Design a protein around this ligand. Sequence first.
Ligand SMILES: CCCCCCCCCCCCCCCCCC(=O)OC[C@H](COP(=O)([O-])OCC(O)COP(=O)([O-])OC[C@@H](COC(=O)CCCCCCCCCCCCCCCCC)OC(=O)CCCCCCCCCCCCCCCCC)OC(=O)CCCCCCCCCCCCCCCCC
Ligand SMILES: CCCCCCCCCCCCCCCCCC(=O)OC[C@H](COP(=O)([O-])OCC(O)COP(=O)([O-])OC[C@@H](COC(=O)CCCCCCCCCCCCCCCCC)OC(=O)CCCCCCCCCCCCCCCCC)OC(=O)CCCCCCCCCCCCCCCCC
Ligand SMILES: CCCCCCCCCCCCCCCCCC(=O)OC[C@H](COP(=O)([O-])OCC(O)COP(=O)([O-])OC[C@@H](COC(=O)CCCCCCCCCCCCCCCCC)OC(=O)CCCCCCCCCCCCCCCCC)OC(=O)CCCCCCCCCCCCCCCCC
Ligand SMILES: CCCCCCCCCCCCCCCCCC(=O)OC[C@H](COP(=O)([O-])OCC(O)COP(=O)([O-])OC[C@@H](COC(=O)CCCCCCCCCCCCCCCCC)OC(=O)CCCCCCCCCCCCCCCCC)OC(=O)CCCCCCCCCCCCCCCCC
Ligand SMILES: CCCCCCCCCCCCO[C@@H]1O[C@H](CO)[C@@H](O[C@H]2O[C@H](CO)[C@@H](O)[C@H](O)[C@H]2O)[C@H](O)[C@H]1O
Ligand SMILES: CCCCCCCCCCCCO[C@@H]1O[C@H](CO)[C@@H](O[C@H]2O[C@H](CO)[C@@H](O)[C@H](O)[C@H]2O)[C@H](O)[C@H]1O
Ligand SMILES: CCCCCCCCCCCCO[C@@H]1O[C@H](CO)[C@@H](O[C@H]2O[C@H](CO)[C@@H](O)[C@H](O)[C@H]2O)[C@H](O)[C@H]1O
Ligand SMILES: CCCCCCCCCCCCO[C@@H]1O[C@H](CO)[C@@H](O[C@H]2O[C@H](CO)[C@@H](O)[C@H](O)[C@H]2O)[C@H](O)[C@H]1O
Ligand SMILES: CCCCCCCCCCCCO[C@@H]1O[C@H](CO)[C@@H](O[C@H]2O[C@H](CO)[C@@H](O)[C@H](O)[C@H]2O)[C@H](O)[C@H]1O
Ligand SMILES: CCCCCCCCCCCCO[C@@H]1O[C@H](CO)[C@@H](O[C@H]2O[C@H](CO)[C@@H](O)[C@H](O)[C@H]2O)[C@H](O)[C@H]1O
Lengths: 96, 104, 108, 69, 104, 51, 51, 94, 59, 179, 60, 74, 21, 110, 63
Amino acid sequence: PFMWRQRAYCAPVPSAFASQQGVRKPLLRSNSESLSVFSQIPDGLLGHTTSVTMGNSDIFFLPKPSNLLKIALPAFVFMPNLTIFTRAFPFYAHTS
Amino acid sequence: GIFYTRFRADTKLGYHVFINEEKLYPDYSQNYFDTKWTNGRKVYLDDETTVEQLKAQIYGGKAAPENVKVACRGRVFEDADNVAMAVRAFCKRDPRLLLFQDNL
Amino acid sequence: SMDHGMQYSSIYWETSHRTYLPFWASLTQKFSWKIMDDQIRSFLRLPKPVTTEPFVFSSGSPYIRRYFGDADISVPVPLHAPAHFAFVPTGTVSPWEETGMETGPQGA
Amino acid sequence: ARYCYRGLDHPFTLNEMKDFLFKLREQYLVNKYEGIQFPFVFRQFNRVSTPGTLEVHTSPALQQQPHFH
Amino acid sequence: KILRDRNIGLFNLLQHHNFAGLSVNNAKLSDSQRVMWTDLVQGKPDVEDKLSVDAREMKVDMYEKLFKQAADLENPCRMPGVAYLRCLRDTLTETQSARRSSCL
Amino acid sequence: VNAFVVKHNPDLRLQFVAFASFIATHMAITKEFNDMYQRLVDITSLLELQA
Amino acid sequence: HEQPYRAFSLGFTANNLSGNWGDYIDRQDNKNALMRPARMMFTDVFIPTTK
Amino acid sequence: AIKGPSVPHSILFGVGAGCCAYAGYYLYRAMRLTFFDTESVALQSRLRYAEKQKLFHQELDRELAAGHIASLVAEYDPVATRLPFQPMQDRYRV
Amino acid sequence: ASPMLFTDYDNTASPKSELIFMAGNALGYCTERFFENEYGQSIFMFALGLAYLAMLGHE
Amino acid sequence: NSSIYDNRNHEAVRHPWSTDARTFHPNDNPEADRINTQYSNMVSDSFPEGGFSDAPRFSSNWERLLAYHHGLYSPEKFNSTTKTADEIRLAVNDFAAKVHADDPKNACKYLMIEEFKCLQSAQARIDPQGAATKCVKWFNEWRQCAWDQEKMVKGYNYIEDRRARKHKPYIGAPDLQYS
Amino acid sequence: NSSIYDNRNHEAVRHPWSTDARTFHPNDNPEADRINTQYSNMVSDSFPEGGFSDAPRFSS
Amino acid sequence: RFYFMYMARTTFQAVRPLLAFSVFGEVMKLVLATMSSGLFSFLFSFVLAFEVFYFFLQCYISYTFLTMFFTVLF
Amino acid sequence: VALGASFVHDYFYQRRPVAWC
Amino acid sequence: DEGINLMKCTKNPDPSFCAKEFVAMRECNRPQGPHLVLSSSPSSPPHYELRPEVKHLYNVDSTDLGSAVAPVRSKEQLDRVADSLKADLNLPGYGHIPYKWESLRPNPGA
Amino acid sequence: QGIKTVYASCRYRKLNEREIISDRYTWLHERMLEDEVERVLLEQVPAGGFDKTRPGLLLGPST
Ligand SMILES: CCCCCCCCCCCCCCCCCC(=O)OC[C@H](COP(=O)([O-])OCC(O)COP(=O)([O-])OC[C@@H](COC(=O)CCCCCCCCCCCCCCCCC)OC(=O)CCCCCCCCCCCCCCCCC)OC(=O)CCCCCCCCCCCCCCCCC
Ligand SMILES: CCCCCCCCCCCCCCCCCC(=O)OC[C@H](COP(=O)([O-])OCC(O)COP(=O)([O-])OC[C@@H](COC(=O)CCCCCCCCCCCCCCCCC)OC(=O)CCCCCCCCCCCCCCCCC)OC(=O)CCCCCCCCCCCCCCCCC
Ligand SMILES: CCCCCCCCCCCCCCCCCC(=O)OC[C@H](COP(=O)([O-])OCC(O)COP(=O)([O-])OC[C@@H](COC(=O)CCCCCCCCCCCCCCCCC)OC(=O)CCCCCCCCCCCCCCCCC)OC(=O)CCCCCCCCCCCCCCCCC
Ligand SMILES: CCCCCCCCCCCCCCCCCC(=O)OC[C@H](COP(=O)([O-])OCC(O)COP(=O)([O-])OC[C@@H](COC(=O)CCCCCCCCCCCCCCCCC)OC(=O)CCCCCCCCCCCCCCCCC)OC(=O)CCCCCCCCCCCCCCCCC
Ligand SMILES: CCCCCCCCCCCCO[C@@H]1O[C@H](CO)[C@@H](O[C@H]2O[C@H](CO)[C@@H](O)[C@H](O)[C@H]2O)[C@H](O)[C@H]1O
Ligand SMILES: CCCCCCCCCCCCO[C@@H]1O[C@H](CO)[C@@H](O[C@H]2O[C@H](CO)[C@@H](O)[C@H](O)[C@H]2O)[C@H](O)[C@H]1O
Ligand SMILES: CCCCCCCCCCCCO[C@@H]1O[C@H](CO)[C@@H](O[C@H]2O[C@H](CO)[C@@H](O)[C@H](O)[C@H]2O)[C@H](O)[C@H]1O
Ligand SMILES: CCCCCCCCCCCCO[C@@H]1O[C@H](CO)[C@@H](O[C@H]2O[C@H](CO)[C@@H](O)[C@H](O)[C@H]2O)[C@H](O)[C@H]1O
Ligand SMILES: CCCCCCCCCCCCO[C@@H]1O[C@H](CO)[C@@H](O[C@H]2O[C@H](CO)[C@@H](O)[C@H](O)[C@H]2O)[C@H](O)[C@H]1O
Ligand SMILES: CCCCCCCCCCCCO[C@@H]1O[C@H](CO)[C@@H](O[C@H]2O[C@H](CO)[C@@H](O)[C@H](O)[C@H]2O)[C@H](O)[C@H]1O
């Protein structure tokens, strides 16, 4: 509230300088309202727009013809076997 | 130790404290394991803690400088204010506090 | 010369970029539980939101809600014709005039 | 998502506010001018309406602005 | 011609936005607003002993809001006005006789 | 359920007809609800354009 | 912990790390200068301009 | 179409199945809203908070614009409204 | 001085005892970035495919 | 004009009076070593110290009046030089003293002071639009702080919902508590 | 300005003095029947009879 | 520190083929985008074939190191 | 079994919001 | 009576949460009298009315400030409001679809 | 979790009701304070009301 001619974002809209226009719309409005989203537009369906959900579409099906294969295939190890040597695991886990 | 750390982290709420100037740093020359102040320090507090209690905890219950105040995101706190609620109001989910001198 | 413009940039799909659409996507359609929830609330007499009441208690000055064809779409409108005040004297400033050039206290 | 479910009273910064207003302006222009396309709004479509006798001319050279030296 | 037109337009704009100045020449004012403005311009703002402390606080807040909207930081009288109203806030729980000696 | 279905649609063609009618009715009711919500959304978009 | 993340796509066939498309306002060409004249060659479908 | 096994009967059966599916949806939502919902209350509270915030910001911006306009009362000169060789009117706040 | 002349806000240290959260924070980052989205669905399909291949090889 | 979203960008501003259209060019490719990094030598990269060369000499007083009335002239903007660092500091310190006297127990005080400071530093007297482009951020922060102070004064809170089932992305991740 | 090879085409001509920039628009889509085909009625399609509105009143 | 060393080695051996397939592919694509004539294309076809063979070599190396790193006695 | 599991996983466990205009 | 009714209602509240009682008490406690009242009418929906002697303090054209109850959801009212807004805007370009997903269905997706 | 959720739903309903009524009571308290202030102000109005035709303060000649 100090530099009015230099701070136009805090100034009234040009329709306010015009001296002409149940309940009526306000006569005085500022440009600082542009810094708010729901100043002029309504807040309708504000907290209900993230609730419109749609399901995924992936199908987990792939025929598994094993009659074509006669050899084994390599397989990964995902976790260490804690059912054996459980008490020493923190002590031998760092080795190889 | 793991239990203490996890419980403190998942139960209490912490703040990263900074200080504006070096002349405002506390005197940690006597106490051991911390012989100097470092900005960005994580400090865990209770929900009932006030700005005065925080200031005393920072300055070791000793005479603090004059006109020292706390701010978060540029917004000054009152000394008779709850830190948790003041942060909730001014800097939500950005608890970085700054201690400065308010002469003006 | 802005309406009905030509295609100014090219449209393309980069190799192996995914689409995330199955073959029944066109038959798929959206849905919101909001209409059914409103019906159920009205039938079971569940707590209503305050937006159903036109008067607004969320401020000290009088506000009235204007509804756009539904209670879910409303805007508060102030009723007061606010009186403004200026602790200023009149005729004490001539900004168009350069005052640094005239001799006098106002000039200095 | 930021205001009603995370507790942020000021979800949008200046950049996000500008982005919102940019999209609002684009909506206005799209509904105002029928068929407006990329150069003025971020939008492209192939099936466009042309006059029938489309003239092709070279654009005018860029305006010579006065400069020192 | 230009000055006459500009000043008539300014007058119409001020009348349209319902402004009131040091010369109270506005008929659409409420009696309470007019009393408050005339006290700020011509009389002495003071809280009455008939009021409860809460109503005195409300009256002082109304005075402060009105005067701060009226006078900006560039205005000379803003600091004295705000100081007087702050003295009133400090001396709410007192009588006018005891408040005069302090706020004069 | 299988008994009640076969009791009234014992043949494959009738089962297919019933399944198709079920799909169509589901889609139609969903379309009614969606039309209502779309009218709301259209009002909001028109107010944004007005702003 | 409050700043948002950019989408991630990585595979033997395609990725989204060899380029940057920019923001919604400040956009930029994802392909670099040497291959911009040959953009057609990096597409499964290409719909040219109208001129 | 009412009793006998026919294409109309199958169509009626499908329509009834769809209506029963939507009745089940109604039951699900009714039970959820009647015994398993706090998001509604939380969101209503947050929206009332938002309304208060909106009105506060609105009033603040209005006050700032009003102060901008008040800065013009110093430029305002009621004597310029005077016509040459005529008296000044109190209407223009002497 | 004023609180706005200060800039070094990103030097947010943390107790050295919180290093135990290394893997936790790593998994949380990987979750918020990859696992709980479409790329995470692709990763889940990759795991299912590993199972598929192991079964195929056994048979 | 500066914005790329303006058709007459990099073109001189048009006034009711005749004006030399040769524009001030900011320093876009400055040398690595700028030995003097004081405000004196920095301001010359974005404004001319002696002011712009688009000032009018009105043939009459009513032309001046009409230009002002329509918002096309202000002496504060057209007949003036750049402000020196000392002047800027004096103005900022006076404004800060006045604000502190107005209200010490206010949280947005330093934010208002900072927007004032940034306007003065960006020379809003002679480049108001360009300076507002820089200071609107501190204005917005002040707006936010105003709301925050009001809600702390008048107790305004809301019913928070229960904690979400997946508040933590991973069980081993720490759920840092936030006020 | 008229030429399409001008950047300020269909824009008012700039003068040293202040000028109303609302331009005279030639008749581009005239009606089929132009009952008066005299020069009097034809000249109004390309020029204004009373002249253009860009004349100056020099202060000196 | 051994865990960090092991994870680094594992990730490098796992991404080696991805690198050979992606970054060298980008290089080849640059060359394709820039080249127009026929002699250079005739000579570059062989570079492409060499890249094929190199990819297969990297895949073999990765398979070896991964079966070494994912082999458990018990 | 795969179709049933995919249906459940997609329309009960993997639902995500979508914008509506 | 206003205070008594407010007290009685706030312990056994109405779905409206006693808003009319609150506003009645607020308007009755005014010194010179109420400015805003609830019109007694044989009509089904009641209205909020404004006294004439205070009309100059409010930004209104008439004394009827609208109904005291929100509207009822109606497809017809929604269509009416939408058509009115479209007419007031007068924007050539509304409803235009430059590209539509090719399908036998008229509206793919929605 | 379902038991806790049922209890929480009931508690949240009651709490929403109480919060609404409490905020409206606060509003009413403030408005009643304003009304008291206005009733005290109306005593300072001179007999016969204000002369809304003339300015309260005449601050210059009219020649
Ligand atoms: C070398 C490496 C080796 C090591 C392996 C390492 C890897 C290990 C890990 C595993 C890999 C994981 C990697 C991550 C994956 C993430 C990416 C991803 O998955 O999606 C990407 C990719 C991205 O697509 P998008 O653009 O993003 O769209 C995504 C959508 O969600 C999906 O898009 P969509 O829905 O549009 O596509 C589905 C598609 C296909 O969907 C299906 O068809 C469903 C599947 C059914 C399969 C069973 C039916 C088989 C019928 C065969 C009979 C033919 C006649 C017999 C002839 C014999 C002589 C030849 O639908 C259609 O195109 C139209 C078909 C519609 C009809 C389907 C239903 C009817 C089926 C019955 C036919 C009836 C016809 C009646 C006609 C009407 C008459 C009135 O997704 C797809 O492309 C999906 C389809 C992929 C098919 C690939 C084709 C090759 C399949 C063979 C694979 C290898 C086989 C191995 C041997 C086993 C078979 C013998
Ligand atoms: C070639 C093949 C031919 C195929 C032919 C197909 C045509 C045949 C007709 C059937 C068509 C398939 C229908 C599929 C379902 C509808 C489509 C769909 O999924 O939309 C998504 C949609 C997703 O809901 P949303 O709100 O958008 O978001 C979901 C999120 O999860 C929400 O997120 P949130 O965080 O809020 O989580 C909330 C969640 C929370 O959930 C939980 O926390 C736990 C869930 C319960 C776990 C179990 C705990 C134990 C307590 C329950 C005890 C149940 C067992 C009984 C025990 C008795 C002893 C006490 O609540 C729920 O999701 C409740 C789920 C309700 C499940 C119970 C309904 C009965 C299931 C059995 C139905 C069998 C149908 C077989 C059809 C024939 C297919 C061959 O589904 C729903 O809206 C809810 C479905 C309500 C049931 C509707 C049933 C009528 C429609 C089907 C007509 C036929 C009825 C036959 C009835 C037979 C007697 C049971
Ligand atoms: C801050 C630090 C951050 C650091 C980074 C951190 C990173 C994040 C955290 C990471 C944590 C680690 C997590 C693990 C890593 C994650 C990996 C991951 O998730 O993947 C994501 C990533 C994909 O994610 P995305 O976001 O969706 O990427 C974009 C899409 O991928 C784009 O899709 P697209 O447009 O490029 O289309 C691709 C297309 C590709 O489709 C194809 O390639 C299929 C072409 C088949 C042609 C021939 C088919 C003949 C069959 C005829 C059947 C009878 C006639 C029926 C007629 C209809 C069918 C044709 O579709 C598919 O991919 C289909 C996949 C599903 C089917 C899989 C089939 C597996 C069969 C395996 C057979 C095993 C045989 C063993 C025999 C051993 C020898 C004795 O993975 C990929 O790279 C995708 C490509 C995967 C390669 C699959 C190639 C399979 C080819 C099998 C050929 C078999 C022929 C054998 C011949 C030899 C015997 C003669
Ligand atoms: C040789 C192998 C066999 C070849 C034949 C395979 C194709 C059979 C299908 C034939 C029917 C085509 C329909 C024609 C009528 C016009 C409609 C139309 O075409 O638009 C569809 C589409 C364009 O659609 P649009 O432009 O978007 O407009 C409307 C939409 O399509 C539609 O509107 P919407 O979006 O609203 O509809 C959504 C929804 C509507 O549909 C649905 O919702 C569900 C539909 C799935 C029904 C599932 C069956 C139901 C089963 C019930 C019973 C269950 C129990 C019993 C079964 C148990 C199973 C064990 O999804 C669909 O649209 C599904 C459409 C699937 C298109 C066909 C996909 C196959 C592509 C070609 C594969 C070629 C394979 C390699 C050939 C190798 C030859 C060397 O165009 C095509 O699909 C083209 C088909 C071309 C067939 C070519 C056959 C090979 C000829 C080779 C020629 C040589 C040159 C080829 C170049 C490469 C040379 C090497
Ligand atoms: C054998 C069964 C064991 C099952 C596990 C039972 C839990 C055992 C640990 C309980 C710790 C009790 O000790 C207490 O913990 C809480 C949380 O840190 C602290 O309380 C702290 O958080 C709560 C929540 O705001 C508040 O009290 C306050 O903010 C703060 O003081 C108390 O200051 C401390 O006295
Ligand atoms: C997780 C890592 C292992 C998996 C690797 C995944 C694929 C790697 C991506 C391709 C690497 C080469 O990527 C190539 O260099 C950079 C990538 O930013 C881009 O280059 C572009 O962005 C860089 C920014 O750093 C600019 O400096 C450069 O002027 C511009 O052309 C090229 O457009 C791209 O072709
Ligand atoms: C074959 C598999 C090959 C890939 C294997 C990769 C396994 C290792 C996963 C990555 C571990 C990185 O570790 C993690 O890095 C991110 C930053 O990038 C940090 O995250 C930090 O910066 C990010 C910004 O992106 C913030 O969102 C986050 O709030 C912050 O904590 C995590 O605090 C740290 O725990
Ligand atoms: C002997 C004591 C009981 C021992 C058994 C403890 C089992 C607790 C783990 C169950 C899962 C809890 O997971 C989560 O934590 C607490 C409840 O605990 C709830 O948290 C929420 O409700 C509780 C009420 O109790 C509030 O205090 C809390 O402020 C709120 O965030 C979440 O709604 C729930 O989803
Ligand atoms: C035709 C037959 C129809 C059968 C109908 C069956 C109805 C079953 C309805 C169960 C709905 C439960 O819905 C889900 O339950 C859990 C606890 O129970 C709720 O609670 C869960 O999430 C919220 C927060 O996200 C918190 O309460 C808490 O963290 C967690 O416990 C979920 O918010 C709710 O989404
Ligand atoms: C044909 C009948 C077959 C019987 C199948 C019965 C299975 C019922 C199990 C349903 C369990 C779903 O569990 C629920 O999944 C949904 C995802 O869709 C999650 O949903 C969550 O994410 C979505 C999307 O962000 C949001 O709406 C919200 O944050 C939350 O609801 C819930 O956090 C989880 O509680």
